[PDB]
Design a protein around this ligand. Structure first.
Ligand SMILES: CC[C@@H](Nc1c(C#N)c(-c2ccc(-c3cccc(Cl)c3F)cc2)nc2cnccc12)C(N)=O
Ligand SMILES: CC[C@@H](Nc1c(C#N)c(-c2ccc(-c3cccc(Cl)c3F)cc2)nc2cnccc12)C(N)=O
Lengths: 322, 312
């Protein structure tokens, strides 16, 4: 059964705190609708164990959840059941990707990131507009899905954490990934980065490697129409420096790595892998693309391009590569 | 389940038991308890801002004493942790009446009583010997079954709480109830006490009413043999001032007269030749008075056993 053990005590507190948060909400009514107070709310928990569970958990920790009712409503609006979320974040420890550091949930559904107190403050600044935007697009958006936000304290180490939905497939592997922005001199992966297993490539890598993305005219028009709305919303909030993250699944590469070791090859569940787009019938390779916006929370007040200019250049760059 | 109550302390108790048991489901059942488990505790302090402001208090603390020991006790007494959690939280405990106050779980399986910090210290003082006594008698005893001990804090007020098992049936009504000590001293329920629906009657009430408990020779032997061993243990811990609690169920006022002895563990049916079809619920309560509060514990125990033997 579930002990929340880790060598990383901050991961043990995160798994414990998500378990607690979700069980607590099981004892709080789902309201007709969110109110203003729900956007300034928190729950704080301080645990002090003495000679109790001293093996599998730290004895002294704090866990704080920001606006629990709002993130619960956001999970529901993005089609995520709270018990599934709880199992994803607690049944086995999140895995490190190894400042660039992130974790993935064990089942690769969710991304966990350490954020600053400035981030948390900016999150509260946008949370009402973000929530209403999610309402009006019926949860259909390329924006990050913010699913939970927490503060952890153990051993005198304080961190803030955000949980988002993975852009990539929980099952289909990515052999190539790009963080894309536009209009940035020398924006390309370092030598050390390109030497890794799965490098995070960037704008000049995408251009200089001849990267194409083969989606049909309909999927392109639907995708670019969402991007425009989402990026216009970000520019209204005065946000900038966001990326399009692009993951490519190569069906025949994935297949050759199985032979070394029921959805058909290249098929995915669009209710789980929500950012997936199939290639068109004339791709030179059978590929599946995963594409969405990440990393939105830079406010213009914090060469300085303005958010209008950033949004136009970004849309122009993505439009010119597809 | 929102743990709502007019009494904030009851919400905290229900939230706390709920949290306690869920937490223990994330903790291994040890091969055996160790000395540290008898000096252990869990503390949680909750501070909510504009969250769950309707059901629950926004600021509270909950401490569980020796959670590993009370979990083991619950198992040794044939109690599943999810049934226990259910009994204490599906619906608020009900107050007996209104120091003498107690609550009953909503399903009448358990007793919840506010105790002093002095009680909490004396429970820690006896708990290793009590646990090892429960091991030795295989959970067969008329002692109080100590199932959980806690400290609650809400809105400036702090209380300590013990949970025990109901001596009485979760189903069968008691029409008559005695607190018996064998004090040759005066022990009579008050006129106020006696005006109630169910008075707590005492030694001299039992004598003056000529109350009879008709048990067959085998049940009485087994019962007095347990009582002897239990009372000799109490005297060895230098505990005194405990009572036999006796509840009488009247079957004719009505299958009638039957009960599950895995739930109502203190039930004993009457002699077939009893002039009334009764069922008796009898066990020891209220053991935590140490002689060091200064008739001695040996004398108390012998005078106690003699009186119970006297009445059957
Ligand atoms: C390039 C990104 C990296 N992987 C990430 C990645 C990160 N880091 C993120 C991510 C980025 C930034 C933030 C974030 C920062 C500050 C404040 C707030 Cl509120 C935030 F939300 C959260 C999550 N999301 C991903 C989604 N799916 C797949 C891969 C992803 C990688 N190297 O592959
Ligand atoms: C006769 C007393 C009352 N009913 C009680 C009753 C009480 N009070 C108790 C009880 C008494 C004392 C304590 C107690 C005090 C101090 C410290 C510690 Cl550690 C204790 F455990 C706990 C529980 N147990 C009962 C069991 N079954 C049926 C009726 C019961 C009643 N009036 O009916």
């Amino acid at each position: 059964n579930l002990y929340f053990q880790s060598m990383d005590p901050l991961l043990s507190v995160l798994m414990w705190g998500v378990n607690h948060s979700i069980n607590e909400l099981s004892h709080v009514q789902i309201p007709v609708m969110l109110m203003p107070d729900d956007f300034k709310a928190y729950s704080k928990i301080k645990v002090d164990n003495h000679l109790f569970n001293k093996e599998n958990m730290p004895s002294h920790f704090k866990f704080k959840e920001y606006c629990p009712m709002v993130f619960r409503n956001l999970r529901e609006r993005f089609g995520i059941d709270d018990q599934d979320f709880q199992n994803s974040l607690t049944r086995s420890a999140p895995l490190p990707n190894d400042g660039a550091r992130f974790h993935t949930s064990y089942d690769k559904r969710y991304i966990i990131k350490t954020i600053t107190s400035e981030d948390v403050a900016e999150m509260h600044n946008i949370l009402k507009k973000y929530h209403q935007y999610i309402v009006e697009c019926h949860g259909i958006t390329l924006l990050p899905q913010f699913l939970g936000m927490y503060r952890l304290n153990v051993d005198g180490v304080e961190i803030y954490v955000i949980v988002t939905r993975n852009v990539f497939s929980h099952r289909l592997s990515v052999y190539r990934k790009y963080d894309l922005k536009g209009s940035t001199v020398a924006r390309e992966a370092s030598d050390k980065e390109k030497a890794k297993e799965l490098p995070t490539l960037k704008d000049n890598d995408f251009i200089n490697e001849g990267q194409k993305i083969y989606i049909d005219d309909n999927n392109k028009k639907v995708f670019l129409e969402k991007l425009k709305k989402d990026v216009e919303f970000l520019a209204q909030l005065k946000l900038m420096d966001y990326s399009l993250l692009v993951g490519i699944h190569d069906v025949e590469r994935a297949e050759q790595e199985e032979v070394e070791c029921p959805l058909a090859p290249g098929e995915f569940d669009p209710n789980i892998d929500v950012y997936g787009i199939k290639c068109h019938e004339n791709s030179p390779r059978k590929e599946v693309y995963f594409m969405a916006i990440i990393d939105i929370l830079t406010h213009y007040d914090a060469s300085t391009v303005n958010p209008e200019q950033y949004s136009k250049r970004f849309l122009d760059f993505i439009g010119h590569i597809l």
